[PDB]
């Protein structure tokens, strides 16, 4: 309910194309979530799920 | 008259030359600030925006009671200004001992009005909480009512009989003490019940004739 109402329209439309629930499939290992979806998921659970990037680094001469 | 005089060049070519340098330095500083801002934002996400409101903090000043008071006064100023506009009538000049007839609404829904008449007894002079007290008698029964000056309910205000005279102006003015004798406080000069006998003064306030 939270994710569905948060995701943009493009993602929302695809969310409705899955044969069943996306959460259950992700939990069960029968579906690979997108970056966008993952973002929302992590926002809900209040904990990162995967090693995120770190946009920082000193250019070496 | 901005700064002390300096022995700077005045040739057009020299000034144009200087301008270039100025421009260059400006550009450089802009670019560097942009770069650092970007970097910071990218890394940490720290943002430093412009002020959104007028606050002492903006001005880099502490919070003081003085400031508080200032603000409070300003708010009353603005409120007065705003309220003045809504009215459809001009308040006439009056004073103590002047017969007046006030007209005010009772019930907006019911359209019930009210008209009071009485002689001025008191005019409490303030900023926003100013009021006037009216007294009258009906069939031998005396009634008294105080009405604020600034009220949206006041339909109308008129004066039936005035008493223009210097006596009213005297009452309508804040007088100053004649002398600093008031500090004497004669009312405090008393004698204790249990205190030693000092003259022929009974317990209580003393006398100044002797």
């Amino acid at each position: 309910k939270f994710v569905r109402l948060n995701v943009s329209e493009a993602q929302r439309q695809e969310i409705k194309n899955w044969p069943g629930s996306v959460v259950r499939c992700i939990e069960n290992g029968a579906c690979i979530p997108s970056r966008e979806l993952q973002s929302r998921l992590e926002q809900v659970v209040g904990v990162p799920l995967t090693r995120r990037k770190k946009r920082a680094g000193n250019r070496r001469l | 008259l901005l700064q002390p005089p300096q022995c700077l060049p005045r040739a057009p070519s020299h000034l144009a030359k200087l301008m270039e340098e100025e421009e260059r330095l400006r550009l450089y500083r802009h670019l560097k600030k942009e770069e650092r801002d970007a970097a910071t934002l990218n890394k940490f996400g720290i943002w430093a925006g412009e002020p959104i409101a007028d606050t002492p903090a903006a001005k880099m000043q502490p919070l003081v009671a003085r400031t508080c008071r200032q603000t409070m006064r300003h708010l009353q100023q603005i409120e007065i200004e705003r309220l003045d506009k809504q009215r459809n009538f001009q308040v006439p000049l009056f004073g103590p001992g002047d017969l007046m007839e006030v007209k005010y609404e009772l019930s907006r829904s019911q359209q019930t009005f009210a008209t009071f008449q009485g002689y001025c007894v008191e005019v409490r002079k303030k900023r926003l909480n100013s009021s006037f007290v009216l007294r009258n008698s009906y069939e031998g029964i005396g009634v008294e009512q105080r009405i604020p000056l600034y009220s949206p309910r006041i339909i109308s205000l008129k004066v039936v009989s005035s008493c223009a005279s210097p006596t009213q102006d005297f009452l309508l003015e804040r007088h100053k003490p004649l002398t600093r004798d008031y500090r004497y406080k004669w009312k405090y000069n008393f004698r204790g019940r249990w205190s030693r006998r000092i003259g022929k003064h009974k317990p209580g306030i003393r006398s100044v004739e002797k």
Partner: protein
């Protein structure tokens, strides 16, 4: 700037050329303009939050004596050892305890540790190891503004004695803090004293024109002294001081006497620091009145020299930043698309220069060799040969001045003292010659170019060539010999002799340049004028042209032959490893000019030998020469029919701006 450093790091052709260690100089810096700085004042509030809670007399840190080279004794039994200790060691061992002259004298009669060379009983030892005069003065920090000048002057009169650095550092700092309280005139004297302390006993570059003081005999066969600690590469004055002091002068520029202005310009020049604001302000004040006349001959030269030295670099830097300015600007994609669619020396005021010229002209006889040379060489920088711009009148004035000076010159009066001084005098004479040469060329070119559309210099010029020929011949024999490139176990090479050798070679190159230029100058004379001009331009640019002839010299032919013989003799016995980089082509050109209608000079010139040595140098230094020089050489060699397997290899396989075009 990150991209700009990466390009320099990735560059395979850019290098730091240096014939000698002393040639290198501190980098040029351009100071900005002053402006109100409210933020710095607010920051200063955070530096004095606990001053009420600190010492009221000595709140600043305490100086530390320099450390020793080797570690101290294990047990630190310095007193028991009985060996003499330096001032810093005694200071550091006695807990940095003051040793007034009486106490030191009493202790020296009881222990031998205090009987050291720096432990002067009549001066004492300071807290920080100060001695020999500095120990008798109080801390610079504690001295009032009004007593700074006297303290510095008294101190100036005072790997040994390493403790003076602390005192001078303190002084430097003090000056900066008390800048805004001292007299404007006293400030200049303080800066000059600091510069003297920081640059005492130094040697100027070989290719440099400007110099603070004149070299003189000092009471080694050559008599010259060198030291890496006092290398000219070292900046006397920190930029901070100058930056801070900049504003002061702007406010009270009208209160500075001509002697103070000359010293200020010299200090700036010595420091290598520049300021547009200041430069322009000084330029726009002084002028000729029918006042520059107040300046004395000694101060005038220095003031001119400094200004020129600074201005040259200023302009140079301006030019450099102009091009870098392009990339900082943003370009939109629409501009890109539109562009795609579509694609389908003068660094002197006229008035100032005129005034200078007039000044020189009017008091030619009052000048000395050094001053005159210095002044002349500076002003000749603007005169070029490509063709605001100075006037013929202005140039004629300077020419006349030169002539007058030459006529009135005695020609040496010190009885031929130290060899370094004699070499410096020879180089100054060569400079003079150079100047003389350039003036004529400018005048002639101007006249000849202007005529198409619609002073006896040589008589005075002739003497300098003879004097140089005699002096170079004498000094070559008087100087000691050294090994040659072309031909305990270690070759004895004293660095102190190569300096004077390079000075002599630079003077010779100067003369060779001058005599070369004179040829063009003369040849410009009335073939059409336009054709003549074209010919001269070809010659200067290094292009295919007519063979150069020597007869055009006329009266100067004998002097040119004598000069060629002198340089041939010098190079036949001293190689070509000390020649300047910026005047290499001229030395080649002069021999090509000499090779004409010859009778016997063909055998001495090969066509070890001077020519061979020159070639050997060319080949060696091919990685440093400019495209102009390279083309000039390429043509010159051809002219003379000089065949060299080595030189021809570099002339056609190691450059793209000459070989990859026809």
């Amino acid at each position: 700037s990150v991209a700009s450093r990466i390009h320099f790091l990735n560059s395979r052709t850019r290098f730091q050329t240096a014939v000698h260690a002393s040639d290198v100089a501190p980098p040029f810096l351009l100071l900005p303009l002053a402006s109100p700085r409210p933020l710095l004042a607010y920051h200063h509030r955070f530096r004095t939050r606990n001053r009420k809670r600190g010492s009221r007399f000595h709140p600043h840190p305490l100086p530390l004596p320099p450390p020793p080279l080797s570690p101290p004794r294990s047990d630190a039994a310095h007193l028991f050892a009985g060996k003499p200790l330096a001032a810093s060691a005694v200071s550091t061992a006695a807990g940095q305890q003051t040793l007034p002259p009486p106490l030191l004298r009493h202790l020296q009669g009881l222990f031998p540790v205090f009987r050291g060379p720096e432990c002067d009983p009549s001066c004492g030892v300071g807290p920080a190891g100060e001695a020999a005069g500095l120990a008798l003065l109080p801390p610079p920090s504690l001295v009032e503004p009004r007593h700074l000048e006297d303290l510095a002057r008294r101190a100036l009169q005072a790997g040994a004695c390493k403790s003076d650095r602390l005192f001078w550092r303190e002084l430097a700092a003090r000056v900066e803090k008390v800048r805004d309280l001292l007299p404007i005139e006293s400030l200049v004297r303080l800066l000059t004293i600091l510069t003297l302390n920081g640059a005492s006993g130094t040697v100027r570059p070989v290719k440099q024109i400007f110099q603070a003081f004149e070299t003189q005999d000092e009471d080694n066969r050559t008599g010259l002294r060198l030291a890496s600690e006092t290398l000219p590469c070292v900046r006397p004055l920190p930029p901070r001081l100058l930056l801070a002091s900049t504003r002061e002068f702007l406010e009270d520029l009208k209160k500075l006497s001509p002697p103070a202005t000359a010293a200020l310009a010299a200090t700036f020049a010595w420091s290598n620091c520049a300021s547009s604001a200041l430069l322009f302000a000084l330029m726009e004040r002084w002028a000729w009145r029918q006042h520059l006349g107040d300046f004395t001959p000694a101060d005038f030269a220095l003031f001119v020299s400094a200004l020129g030295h600074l201005l040259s670099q200023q302009e140079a830097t301006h030019v450099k930043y102009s091009r870098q300015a392009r990339h900082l600007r943003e370009i939109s994609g629409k501009q890109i698309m539109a562009a795609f669619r579509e694609q389908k020396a003068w660094h002197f005021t006229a008035a100032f220069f005129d005034g200078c010229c007039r000044f020189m002209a009017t008091r030619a006889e009052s000048f000395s060799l050094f001053s005159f040379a210095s002044a002349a060489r500076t002003l000749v920088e603007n005169l070029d040969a490509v063709a605001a711009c100075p006037t013929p009148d202005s140039v004629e004035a300077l020419a006349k001045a030169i002539s007058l000076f030459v006529a009135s010159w005695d020609g040496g009066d010190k009885t031929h003292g130290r060899l370094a001084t004699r070499a410096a005098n020879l180089l100054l004479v060569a400079r003079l010659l150079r100047a003389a040469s350039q003036c004529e060329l400018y005048i002639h070119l101007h006249r000849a170019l202007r005529l198409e559309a619609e002073v006896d210099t040589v008589g005075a010029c002739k003497t300098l060539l003879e004097h140089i020929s005699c002096e170079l011949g004498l000094l070559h024999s008087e100087l000691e010999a050294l090994p040659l490139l072309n031909s305990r176990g270690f070759v004895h090479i004293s660095p102190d002799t190569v300096y004077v050798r390079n000075e002599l070679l630079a003077a010779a190159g100067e003369s060779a340049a001058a005599v070369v230029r004179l040829h063009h100058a003369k040849s410009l004379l009335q073939l059409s004028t336009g054709a003549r001009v074209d010919r001269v331009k070809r010659w200067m640019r290094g292009q295919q042209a007519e063979r150069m002839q020597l007869e055009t010299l006329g009266e100067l032919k004998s002097e040119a032959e004598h000069l060629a013989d002198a340089i041939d003799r010098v190079l036949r016995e001293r190689g070509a490893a000390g020649l300047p980089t910026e005047q290499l082509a001229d030395l080649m050109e002069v021999f090509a000019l000499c090779v004409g209608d010859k009778r016997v000079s063909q055998t001495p010139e090969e066509t070890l030998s001077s020519l061979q040595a020159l070639s050997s140098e060319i080949v060696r230094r091919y990685a440093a020469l400019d495209v102009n020089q390279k083309r000039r050489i390429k043509w010159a060699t051809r002219q003379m029919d000089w065949k060299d397997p080595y030189l021809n290899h570099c002339l056609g396989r190691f450059t793209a701006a000459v070989t990859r075009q026809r």
